[PDB]
Amino acid sequence: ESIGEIMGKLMQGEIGDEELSKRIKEIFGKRLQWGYKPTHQQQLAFNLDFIKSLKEMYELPSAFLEAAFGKTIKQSGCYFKDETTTIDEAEEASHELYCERAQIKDGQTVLDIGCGQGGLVLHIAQKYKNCHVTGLTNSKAQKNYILMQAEKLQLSNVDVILADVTKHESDKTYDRILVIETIEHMKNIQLFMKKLSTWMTEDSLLFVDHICHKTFSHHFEAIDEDDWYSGFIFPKGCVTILSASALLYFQDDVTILDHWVVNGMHMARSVDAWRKKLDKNMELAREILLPGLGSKEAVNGVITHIRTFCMGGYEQFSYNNGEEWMVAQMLFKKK
Amino acid sequence: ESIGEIMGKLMQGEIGDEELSKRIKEIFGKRLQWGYKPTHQQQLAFNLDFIKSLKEMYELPSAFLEAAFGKTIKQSGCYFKDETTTIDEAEEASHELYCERAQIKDGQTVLDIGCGQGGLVLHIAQKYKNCHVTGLTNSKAQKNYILMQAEKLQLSNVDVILADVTKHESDKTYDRILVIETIEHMKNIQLFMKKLSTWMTEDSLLFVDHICHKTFSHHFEAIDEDDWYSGFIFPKGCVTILSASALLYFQDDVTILDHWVVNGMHMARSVDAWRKKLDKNMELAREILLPGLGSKEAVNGVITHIRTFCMGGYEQFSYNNGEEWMVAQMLFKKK
Ligand SMILES: Nc1ncnc2c1ncn2[C@@H]1O[C@H](CSCC[C@H](N)C(=O)O)[C@@H](O)[C@H]1O
Numbered sequence: 153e154s155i156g157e158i159m160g161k162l163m164q165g166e167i168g169d170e171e172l173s174k175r176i177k178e179i180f181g182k183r184l185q186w187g188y189k190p191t192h193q194q195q196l197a198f199n200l201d202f203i204k205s206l207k208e209m210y211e212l213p214s215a216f217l218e219a220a221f222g223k224t225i226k227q228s229g230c231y232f233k234d235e236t237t238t239i240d241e242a243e244e245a246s247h248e249l250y251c252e253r254a255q256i257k258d259g260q261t262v263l264d265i266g267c268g269q270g271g272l273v274l275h276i277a278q279k280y281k282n283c284h285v286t287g288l289t290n291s292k293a294q295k296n297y298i299l300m301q302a303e304k305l306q307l308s309n310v311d312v313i314l315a316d317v318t319k320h321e322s323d324k325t326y327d328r329i330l331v332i333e334t335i336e337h338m339k340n341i342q343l344f345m346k347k348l349s350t351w352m353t354e355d356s357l358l359f360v361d362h363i364c365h366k367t368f369s370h371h372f373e374a375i376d377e378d379d380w381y382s383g384f385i386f387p388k389g390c391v392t393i394l395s396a397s398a399l400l401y402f403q404d405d406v407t408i409l410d411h412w413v414v415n416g417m418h419m420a421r422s423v424d425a426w427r428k429k430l431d432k433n434m435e436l437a438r439e440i441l442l443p444g445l446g447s448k449e450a451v452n453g454v455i456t457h458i459r460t461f462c463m464g465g466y467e468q469f470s471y472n473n474g475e476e477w478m479v480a481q482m483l484f485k486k487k
Numbered sequence: 488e489s490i491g492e493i494m495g496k497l498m499q500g501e502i503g504d505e506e507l508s509k510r511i512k513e514i515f516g517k518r519l520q521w522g523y524k525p526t527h528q529q530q531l532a533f534n535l536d537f538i539k540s541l542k543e544m545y546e547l548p549s550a551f552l553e554a555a556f557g558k559t560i561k562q563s564g565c566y567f568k569d570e571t572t573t574i575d576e577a578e579e580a581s582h583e584l585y586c587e588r589a590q591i592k593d594g595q596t597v598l599d600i601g602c603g604q605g606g607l608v609l610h611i612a613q614k615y616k617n618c619h620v621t622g623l624t625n626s627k628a629q630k631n632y633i634l635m636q637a638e639k640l641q642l643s644n645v646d647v648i649l650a651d652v653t654k655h656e657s658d659k660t661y662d663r664i665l666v667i668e669t670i671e672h673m674k675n676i677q678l679f680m681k682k683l684s685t686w687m688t689e690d691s692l693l694f695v696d697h698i699c700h701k702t703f704s705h706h707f708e709a710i711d712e713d714d715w716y717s718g719f720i721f722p723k724g725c726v727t728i729l730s731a732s733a734l735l736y737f738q739d740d741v742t743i744l745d746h747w748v749v750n751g752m753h754m755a756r757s758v759d760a761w762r763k764k765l766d767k768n769m770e771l772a773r774e775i776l777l778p779g780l781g782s783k784e785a786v787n788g789v790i791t792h793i794r795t796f797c798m799g800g801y802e803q804f805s806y807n808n809g810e811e812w813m814v815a816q817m818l819f820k821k822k
Pocket residue numbers: 225226227228265266267268269271288289290291315316317318331332333334337
């Protein structure tokens with residue numbers, strides 16, 4: 153059976169969830185076989201080859217996002233204390249975790265790089281009224297959404313920079329720089345970390361959170377010709393999954409102070425919550441999307457893409473009870 | 488059975504090798520249980536706690552050493568291509584490995600920190616006649632031994648600094664700094680790496696080789712009250728076994744370029760060769776030591792200490808076919 157065949161059935165909703173999960177799990181299983189080496193000697197050779205290679209290198213309506221994601225439309229792994237923790241509670245808990253680990257204090261200047269729909273920006277601005285908080289995003293729609301929310305919440309300490317971070321030039325420095333699930337999209341990491349360091353003083357801290365594998369790094373791309381999934385989710389070679397330790401080798405310009413991971417079940421529960429919420433609001437979602445997309449068929453295509461992303465993410469992050477793919481966090485100071 | 492009881496039998500040669508190996512293997516097994524955590528989250532918490540803690544902190548006659556060790560009296564893990572590779576061949580192969588990985592080139596100034604009996608110093612000086620090679624050791628006997636060997640080998644490009652490296656002050660810089668199995672003895676690693684960086688220019692490289700565990704760090708000390716071994720081998724708290732990645736968190740002053748490990752079977756074969764050679768030359772060894780030690784009993788004590796070190800090292804490094812304790816190597820440049 154070809155890719156086209158599987159893709160055809162998928163788009164027609166003719167693959168049941170059980171089979172879909174099974175198929176995607178197997179694709180990730182093959183990635184694990186690709187990434188694990190028989191000896192630590194070989195593991196490090198493999199990992200260093202990857203690190204060396206790095207050193208050489210339409211928008212959805214907000215009503216739809218509100219129908220699929222949690223309250224602040226967080227698009228990153230959340231943190232679930234309990235089995236019954238809601239996605240809204242999990243977003244808040246993860247915002248609080250970042251504030252704790254990045255050592256946020258009232259009065260600081262804070263920059264959130266690739267801030268998305270600005271959940272973290274709004275959380276810090278509300279919690280710490282004397283902080284000034286800047287979000288940076290390359291999306292005009294996201295900028296507009298954040299500014300509207302800040303206005304509704306009576307927050308006067310928020311601004312948003314609309315920029316491609318890789319092109320942004322500024323002399324401005326910040327007490328705290330946060331990068332939540334943006335670094336996976338960065339084509340040139342050494343240059344990225346260097347740029348960030350120029351926006352820090354000797355008193356600043358940099359906090360990065362990124363999806364990872366605990367042992368090895370990989371580009372998010374087809375493992376072989378039987379992998380219909382990877383390229384469906386990201387039709388471009390634009391996402392890298394760093395190992396949990398990969399950024400330790402990018403200390404040219406910043407110096408590590410602390411290092412954590414969060415078990416993958418938290419991310420698994422995040423994507424599960426999104427999937428279930430989308431499913432609950434399926435009819436509403438289809439109504440919202442129809443104007444901007446033009447046909448029920450294009451609508452179905454967008455929904456299938458997002459739903460499959462969640463189904464696949466579930467298998468990826470829940471693999472071996474969260475002990476394969478997970479979330480890495482690091483705290484750095486400037487050199 | 489108490490420590491005293493086991494120690495008594497050991498000193499009397501009443502513990503057979505099979506039982507001795509079994510006992511020491513069990514001690515290391517308990518260390519593995521202590522060091523491995525159930526989740527990567529917990530593993531990193533454990534490892535970072537260790538790294539944070541670090542950031543707060545009679546000579547044997549040469550004739551005896553010649554009778555127990557290989558030709559250049561290398562006192563570090565060697566490299567064995569084949570089952571029949573001799574200790575002399577393995578010393579040379581490991582010297583060549585260091586030259587390759589540290590990117591030694593003719594004409595460079597080279598500093599070997601804690602150079603021991605100077606095998607590496609003499610190897611580089613002979614292979615690269617336009618290099619100047621300096622060994623640094625805190626032992627006057629080692630300095631004297633190296634200078635004698637340099638004279639016998641018609642080497643004119645060797646000097647030796649007699650110094651405690653932690654106290655040595657100099658404005659001199661070197662193209663290459665090598666640290667082979669010395670860092671395990673360094674009480675203040677952050678300060679050590681900082682000092683090394685002051686002896687480098689922008690063109691220099693620093694190569695470190697250290698005994699490690701692939702996953703976690705530990706002080707070499709009694710795991711519990713049943714551990715007679717650890718404190719027998721090092722009666723002081725003076726040896727730390729860093730994890731294979733521990734030095735990645737010490738890039739305040741230097742920046743990593745490359746990272747390897749060498750499987751533990753090489754070290755296992757090294758200590759095995761020493762043990763077998765000592766055993767072969769047992770009578771001669773006892774004759775050599777008697778003058779300086781004063782009695783057959785003191786002689787037996789020194790021999791038992793060294794032989795047990797080799798027997799225990801065998802169990803440590805061969806554990807799980809070399810995939811627990813092993814040798815880590817890193818290459819760095821100056822910040
Ligand atoms: N070059 C670039 N400049 C700015 N933002 C970018 C970027 N490349 C990607 N991004 C944005 O980075 C974000 C990563 S998704 C995470 C969003 C937010 N930090 C959250 O946790 O919810 C996306 O919004 C993506 O579009």
